[PDB]
Amino acid sequence: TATGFDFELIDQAGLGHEKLTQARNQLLAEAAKHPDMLTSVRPNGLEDTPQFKIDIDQEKAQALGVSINDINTTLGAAWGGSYVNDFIDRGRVKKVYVMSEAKYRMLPDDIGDWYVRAADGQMVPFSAFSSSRWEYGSPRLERYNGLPSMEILGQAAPGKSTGEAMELMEQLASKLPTGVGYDWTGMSYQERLSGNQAPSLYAISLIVVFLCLAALYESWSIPFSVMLVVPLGVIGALLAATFRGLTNDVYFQVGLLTTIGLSAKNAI
Amino acid sequence: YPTIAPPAVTISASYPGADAKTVQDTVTQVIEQNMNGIDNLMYMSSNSDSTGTVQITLTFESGTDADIAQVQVQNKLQLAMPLLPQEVQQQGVSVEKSSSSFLMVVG
Amino acid sequence: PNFFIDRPIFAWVIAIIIMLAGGLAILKLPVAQYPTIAPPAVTISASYPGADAKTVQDTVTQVIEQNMNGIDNLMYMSSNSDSTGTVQITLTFESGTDADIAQVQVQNKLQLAMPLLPQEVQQQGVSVEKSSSSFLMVVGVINTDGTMTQEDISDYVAANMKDAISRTSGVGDVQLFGSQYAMRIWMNPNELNKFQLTPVDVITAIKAQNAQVAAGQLGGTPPVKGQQLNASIIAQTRLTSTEEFGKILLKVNQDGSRVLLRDVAKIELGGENYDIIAEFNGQPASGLGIKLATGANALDTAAAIRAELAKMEPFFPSGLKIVYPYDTTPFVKISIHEVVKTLVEAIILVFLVMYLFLQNFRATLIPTIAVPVVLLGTFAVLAAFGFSINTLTMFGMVLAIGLLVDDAIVVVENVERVMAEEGLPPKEATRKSMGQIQGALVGIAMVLSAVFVPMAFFGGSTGAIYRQFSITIVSAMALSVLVALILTPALCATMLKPIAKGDHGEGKKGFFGWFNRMFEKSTHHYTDSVGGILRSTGRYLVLYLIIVVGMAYLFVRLPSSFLPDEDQGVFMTMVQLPAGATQERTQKVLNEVTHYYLTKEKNNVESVFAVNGFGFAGAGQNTGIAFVSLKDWADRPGEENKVEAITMRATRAFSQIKDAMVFAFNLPAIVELGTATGFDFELIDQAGLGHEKLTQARNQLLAEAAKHPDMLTSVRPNGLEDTPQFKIDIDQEKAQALGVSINDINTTLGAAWGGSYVNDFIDRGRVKKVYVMSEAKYRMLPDDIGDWYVRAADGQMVPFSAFSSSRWEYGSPRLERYNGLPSMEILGQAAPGKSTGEAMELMEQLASKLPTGVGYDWTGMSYQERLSGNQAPSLYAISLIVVFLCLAALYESWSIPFSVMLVVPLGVIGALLAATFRGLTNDVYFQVGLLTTIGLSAKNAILIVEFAKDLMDKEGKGLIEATLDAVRMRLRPILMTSLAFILGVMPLVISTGAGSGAQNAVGTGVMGGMVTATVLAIFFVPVFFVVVRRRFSRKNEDIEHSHT
Amino acid sequence: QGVFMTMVQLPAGATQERTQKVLNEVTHYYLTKEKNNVESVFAVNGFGFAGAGQ
Amino acid sequence: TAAAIRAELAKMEPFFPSGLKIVYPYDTTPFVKISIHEVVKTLVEAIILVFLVM
Ligand SMILES: CCCCCCCCCCCCO[C@@H]1O[C@H](CO)[C@@H](O[C@H]2O[C@H](CO)[C@H](O)[C@H](O)[C@H]2O)[C@@H](O)[C@H]1O
Closest-CA residue to B31 (of C1016, C167, C889): C167
E-state strands within E1-54: none
Domains contained in chain C, number: 8
Q: Do the Cβ atoms of C963 and C1026 come closer than 8 Å?
A: yes
Nearest CA in chain C to E11: C855
Distance CA C705, CA C700 (A): 9
Give percent helix, percent strand, percent coil of chain E, each to the nearest 5: 70, 0, 30
> For chain E, give me the number of helices (H) and strands (E)?
2, 0
Residues in contact with C139: Cβ distance below 8 Å, sequence separation at least 6, in sequence order: C287, C288, C290, C309, C322, C323, C324, C325
**Which residues from E are below 8 Å from C855, CB to CB?**
11, 14-15
Q: C528 CA to middle of ligand 1, Å?
A: 7
Substitution candidate for ligand 1 out of C514, C528, C533 with most atoms within 8 A of CB: C533
Q: Do the Cβ atoms of C430 and C491 come closer than 8 Å?
A: no
Neighbours of chain D (3+ CB pairs under 8 A): A, B, C
Helix (H, G, I), strand (E, B) or coil at B43: strand
Distances (CA, A) of C1044 to A34, B37, C954, C1034, C1039: 90, 75, 9, 20, 17
Residues in contact with C142: Cβ distance below 8 Å, sequence separation at least 6, in sequence order: C153, C280, C283, C284, C285, C320, C321, C323
**Which residues from A are below 8 Å from C234, CB to CB?**
51-54, 135, 137
The ligand 1 atom nearest the CA atom of C539: 18
Measured between CA atoms, how close is C220 to chain D, in angstroms? 10
Neighbours of chain C (3+ CB pairs under 8 A): A, B, D, E
DSSP-assigned letter for residue A125: B
- 3-state helix/strand/coil string of C502-539: CCCCCCCCCCCHHHHHHHHHHHHHHHHHHHHHHCCCHH
Other CB atoms closer than 10 Å to residue C849's CB: what's the count? 9
E-state strands within B1-107: 8-14, 41-49, 53-60, 93-98
Tell whether B19 is covered by a domain.
yes
**Which residues from D are below 8 Å from A139, CB to CB?**
51-53
User: In this structure, which long-range contacts are made by residues C614-618, counting pairs with CB atoms below 8 Å and at least 24 apart in sequence?
Assistant: C614/C175, C614/C177, C614/C276, C615/C574, C615/C575, C615/C576, C616/C574, C617/C80, C617/C82, C617/C718, C617/C719, C617/C814, C618/C80, C618/C82, C618/C84, C618/C86, C618/C88, C618/C814
**Which residues from D are below 8 Å from A44, CB to CB?**
50
Other CB atoms closer than 10 Å to residue A72's CB: what's the count? 19
Distance CA C772, CA C795 (A): 23
Report the run of H or E that residue C345 belongs to, with start and end. helix C329-358
Is C1015 close to ligand 1, i.e. is its CB under 6 Å away? Answer: no
Is C1030 close to ligand 1, i.e. is its CB under 6 Å away? Answer: no
Is C538 close to ligand 1, i.e. is its CB under 6 Å away? Answer: no
Distance CA C645, CA C647 (A): 6
Report the run of H or E that residue C81 belongs to, with start and end. strand C74-82
Q: At what angle do helices C461-494 and C8-27 cross, to 10 degrees?
A: 150
Residues in contact with C117: Cβ distance below 8 Å, sequence separation at least 6, in sequence order: C46, C59, C60, C63, C64, C126
E-state strands within A109-192: 133-137, 140-144, 147-154, 180-184
User: In this structure, which long-range contacts are made by residues C685-691, counting pairs with CB atoms below 8 Å and at least 24 apart in sequence?
Assistant: C685/C821, C685/C822, C685/C823, C685/C853, C685/C854, C686/C821, C686/C853, C686/C854, C686/C855, C686/E12, C686/E14, C686/E15, C687/C852, C687/C853, C687/E15, C688/C853, C689/C851, C689/C853, C689/C854, C691/C722, C691/C811, C691/C812, C691/C815, C691/C822
Distance CA B39, CA B68 (A): 9
Report the run of H or E that residue C543 belongs to, with start and end. helix C538-556
Helix (H, G, I), strand (E, B) or coil at C389: coil
Other CB atoms closer than 10 Å to residue B90's CB: what's the count? 9
Helix (H, G, I), strand (E, B) or coil at C127: strand
Q: Do the Cβ atoms of C952 and C964 come closer than 8 Å?
A: no
The residues pairing with B11 across neighbouring beta strands, listed in sequence order, are: B56, B95
Alpha helices in C574-725 (DSSP H): 583-597, 643-655, 690-704
Tell me the backbone φ, ψ of residue C711, rounded to 5 degrees: -155, -55
Distance CA C145, CA C756 (A): 35
Is C524 close to ligand 1, i.e. is its CB under 6 Å away? Answer: no
Tally A–D CB contacts below 8 A: 16
Strands C756-763, C766-774: pairing is antiparallel
Q: Do the Cβ atoms of C630 and C642 come closer than 8 Å?
A: no
Same domain, A43 and A54: no
Same domain, C869 and C999: yes
**Which residues from C are below 8 Å from B44, CB to CB?**
167
The ligand 1 atom nearest the CA atom of C523: 5
Give CA torsion, residues C1018, C1022, C1028, C1033, to 10 deg.
150
Same domain, A8 and A42: yes
The residues pairing with C82 across neighbouring beta strands, listed in sequence order, are: C814
Distance CA C740, CA C792 (A): 4
Q: At what angle do helices C329-358 and C391-419 cross, to 10 degrees?
A: 10
**Amino acid, single-letter form, for residue C495:** M
Widest pairwise Cα distance in chain A: 106
Helix (H, G, I), strand (E, B) or coil at E52: helix
Is C1041 close to ligand 1, i.e. is its CB under 6 Å away? Answer: no
Residues in chain D: 54
Distances (CA, A) of A44 to A5, A9, A189: 12, 12, 17
Distance CA C916, CA C557 (A): 10
CA A268 to chain centre: 50
Distance CA D4, CA C1043 (A): 88
Other CB atoms closer than 10 Å to residue C190's CB: what's the count? 11
Q: Please report, in angstroms and rounded to a whole number, the separation of the first and last CA atoms in chain C.
A: 23
Tell me the backbone φ, ψ of residue C125, rounded to 5 degrees: 90, 125
The ligand 1 atom nearest the CA atom of C528: 35
Report the run of H or E that residue C825 belongs to, with start and end. strand C821-830
Using the Cα atoms of residue C167, residue C170, residue C172 and residue C177 in order, give the sign of their dihedral. negative
Residues in contact with C365: Cβ distance below 8 Å, sequence separation at least 6, in sequence order: C495
Q: Do the Cβ atoms of C1030 and C541 come closer than 8 Å?
A: no
Q: Do the Cβ atoms of C929 and C1002 come closer than 8 Å?
A: yes
Strands C86-93, C135-141: pairing is unpaired
Strands C231-234, A49-53: pairing is parallel
Q: Do the Cβ atoms of B48 and B28 come closer than 8 Å?
A: yes
Residues in chain A: 268
Give CA torsion, residues B28, B34, B40, B44, to 10 deg.
20
Give CA torsion, residues C155, C158, C161, C162, to 10 deg.
160
Same domain, C422 and C305: no
Closest-CA residue to C130 (of C162, C109, C104): C104
Alpha helices in C161-198 (DSSP H): 189-194
Report the run of H or E that residue C492 belongs to, with start and end. helix C461-494
The residues pairing with B48 across neighbouring beta strands, listed in sequence order, are: A141, B54
Q: Give the domain range for residue C140.
A: 132-178+275-327
Distance CA C338, CA C331 (A): 10
Is C852 within 8 Å of chain E by CB? yes
Q: At what angle do helices C361-368 and C461-494 cross, to 10 degrees?
A: 150
Report the run of H or E that residue B21 belongs to, with start and end. helix B20-22
Q: Do the Cβ atoms of C506 and C520 come closer than 8 Å?
A: yes
Same domain, A82 and A7: no
**Amino acid, single-letter form, for residue A227:** M
CA C64 to chain centre: 30
Distance CA C1008, CA C598 (A): 43
Residues in contact with A204: Cβ distance below 8 Å, sequence separation at least 6, in sequence order: C24
Using the Cα atoms of residue D24, residue D30, residue D36 and residue D38 in order, give the sign of their dihedral. negative
Residues in contact with C541: Cβ distance below 8 Å, sequence separation at least 6, in sequence order: C1023, C1027
The ligand 1 atom nearest the CA atom of C526: 7
Q: Do the Cβ atoms of C128 and C113 come closer than 8 Å?
A: no
Same domain, C635 and C495: no
Give percent helix, percent strand, percent coil of chain A, each to the nearest 5: 40, 20, 40
Distances (CA, A) of C624 to C138, C235, C279, C564, C581: 16, 48, 11, 28, 11
Same domain, C577 and C700: no
Alpha helices in C867-958 (DSSP H): 872-891, 898-901, 904-918, 924-953
Distances (CA, A) of C684 to A209, C691, C706, E5: 68, 10, 20, 19
Per-residue DSSP letters for C844-884?
A: HHHTTSS-TTEEEEE-THHHHHHSS---HHHHHHHHHHHHH
Tell me the backbone φ, ψ of residue C79, rounded to 5 degrees: -110, 140
Q: C1015 CA to middle of ligand 1, Å?
A: 14
Q: Do the Cβ atoms of C764 and A11 come closer than 8 Å?
A: no
Is C525 close to ligand 1, i.e. is its CB under 6 Å away? Answer: yes
Distance CA C293, CA C302 (A): 11
Distances (CA, A) of C90 to C74, C295, C814: 11, 17, 14
Distance CA C801, CA C789 (A): 9
Distance CA C463, CA C468 (A): 9
* Structural domain ending residue among the three candidates C643, C672, C701: C672
DSSP-assigned letter for residue C1011: H
Is D11 within 8 Å of chain B by CB? no
Give CA torsion, residues C793, C797, C798, C799, to 10 deg.
160
Tell me the backbone φ, ψ of residue C348, rounded to 5 degrees: -50, -50
E-state strands within C142-285: 175-177, 181-187, 216-218, 231-234, 265-271, 277-280, 283-284
Q: Do the Cβ atoms of B57 and B45 come closer than 8 Å?
A: yes
Distance CA C712, CA E26 (A): 46
Alpha helices in chain A (DSSP H): 17-30, 68-79, 162-172, 187-190, 198-216, 221-227, 230-244, 250-267
Residues in contact with C511: Cβ distance below 8 Å, sequence separation at least 6, in sequence order: none
Distance CA C178, CA C151 (A): 7
Same domain, C885 and C921: yes
Same domain, A39 and A63: no
Burial code of A196-231, b = ≥16 C-beta within 10 A, e = fewer? eeeeeeeeeeeeebbbebbbebeeeeebeebbebee
Tell whether B30 is covered by a domain.
yes
Closest-CA residue to C82 (of C620, C464, C526): C620
A and C in touch (3+ CB pairs within 8 angstroms)? yes
Report the run of H or E that residue A43 belongs to, with start and end. strand A42-43
* Rg value, chain D, Cα: 12
Q: Please report, in angstroms and rounded to a whole number, the separation of the first and last CA atoms in chain E.
A: 43
- Burial environment of residue E20 by CB neighbours within 10 A (0 to 12, 13 to 18, 19 or more): exposed
**Cβ distance of B16 and A83 shorter than 8 Å:** yes
Distance CA C242, CA C266 (A): 10
Distance CA C788, CA C804 (A): 12
Angle at the Cα of C325 (from C324 to C330), degrees rounded to 5? 75
Alpha helices in C28-149 (DSSP H): 53-56, 62-64, 99-110, 119-124
